[model samples]
Target chain A: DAEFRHDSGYEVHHQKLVFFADVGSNKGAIIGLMVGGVV
Target chain B: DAEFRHDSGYEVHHQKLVFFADVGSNKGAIIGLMVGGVV
Candidate 1:
């Protein structure tokens, strides 16, 4: 689930993309964050 | 800096906020991501 808080810093469009993209899924997102070096 | 690539899934507005909010920066972002449990 790429459901971020309304207050989150990501954009709606991007959020949508992330939501649909497999990478936007919680598992993928966590992986993304880690790959992004944010995790 | 919160400068995500065009390929990134975050928003422009959010990117700017993250850029200024300090949390969007690398150091704080790492912390944010960790707190978000993505890290």
Candidate 2:
């Protein structure tokens, strides 16, 4: 059987932001910032 | 055992955003905006 991926802490929260924010926001500033900082 | 892929950074955040905001938010406005460009 194949296992799915799971987030630990910040990764989880961050993913949520990108997935959703990516769609709603046009600037993508938040996502960019979060990505830059986190990643 | 199989190897798993880990999100470098942005990918992780994007994933979380999908799990939480995707379901929590009714409008999904945020998501639409994020993926529009980043994804």
Candidate 3:
């Protein structure tokens, strides 16, 4: 477990994203860079 | 922009990943963490 994530991020992760049918277009891929930039 | 991604990656980007209706199971999310661990 990432003690970094030992708090509550996982559930929010599931609740917000898994619920979506489509995460986004490959435009979503654009954010993958941004994401890698962040976390 | 991540020059890290600028070489042959983006063409392979659409070639490899797009044209999908589903991206992944949330097991994909697990891959995401490993991504952050790297990039």
Candidate 4:
């Protein structure tokens, strides 16, 4: 997880992403990045 | 955009996703789905 960061004007947090289905032509994979933190 | 939805115990909002880089083997795409909504 990443520390809270500001984006544009939104509060975002790091999250792990896993795509089981194909994304267009890109193969599904597991990744992580700073994203929305609302819960 | 999709309606607000709940996952497990988290509140999520639909968002449009555009992958510019190849995801493993899957090609980048423009997709939308329910995701975290924290700003």
Better of 2 and 3 by DockQ: 2
Docking class of 1: incorrect
For each model in turn, which proportion of the native inter-chain contacts is also found? 0.10, 0.18, 0.03, 0.13
**What order do you get sorting by DockQ, best first?**
2, 4, 1, 3
lDDT of 1: 0.30
Tens-place lDDT per residue, model 2, B1-39, is 335644454443334323223333243222233332543
Estimated TM-score for each candidate: 0.13, 0.17, 0.17, 0.15
Instruction: Give the CAPRI rating of model 3.
Output: incorrect
Supply the TM-score for candidate 3.
0.17
Itemize residue pairs with steric clashes in candidate 1.
A1-A26, A11-B11, A39-B39
The TM-score of candidate 1 is 0.13
Worst 10 residues of 2 chain A by lDDT: A30-39
Evaluate candidate 1 by giving its C-alpha RMSD to the native, one decimal. Answer: 17.6
Name the docking class for model 4: incorrect
Ranking by TM-score: 3, 2, 4, 1
- Rate residue B27 of model 2 by lDDT: 36
Q: Model 1 chain A: which ten-residue window has the lowest total lDDT?
A: A16-25
Higher-DockQ candidate of 1 and 2: 2
Candidate number with the higher TM-score (2 or 3): 3
Best model number under DockQ: 2
lDDT of 4 at B11: 35
lDDT (10s digit) by residue, model 3, range B1-39 = 332322231222112232223554333232322234342
- Give the per-residue lDDT digits (tens) of candidate 4, residues B1-39: 324322343334455444334344433333233245332
Instruction: List TM-score (chain A only) for every prediction.
Output: 0.14, 0.16, 0.14, 0.16
At residue A29, candidate 3 shows an lDDT of 23
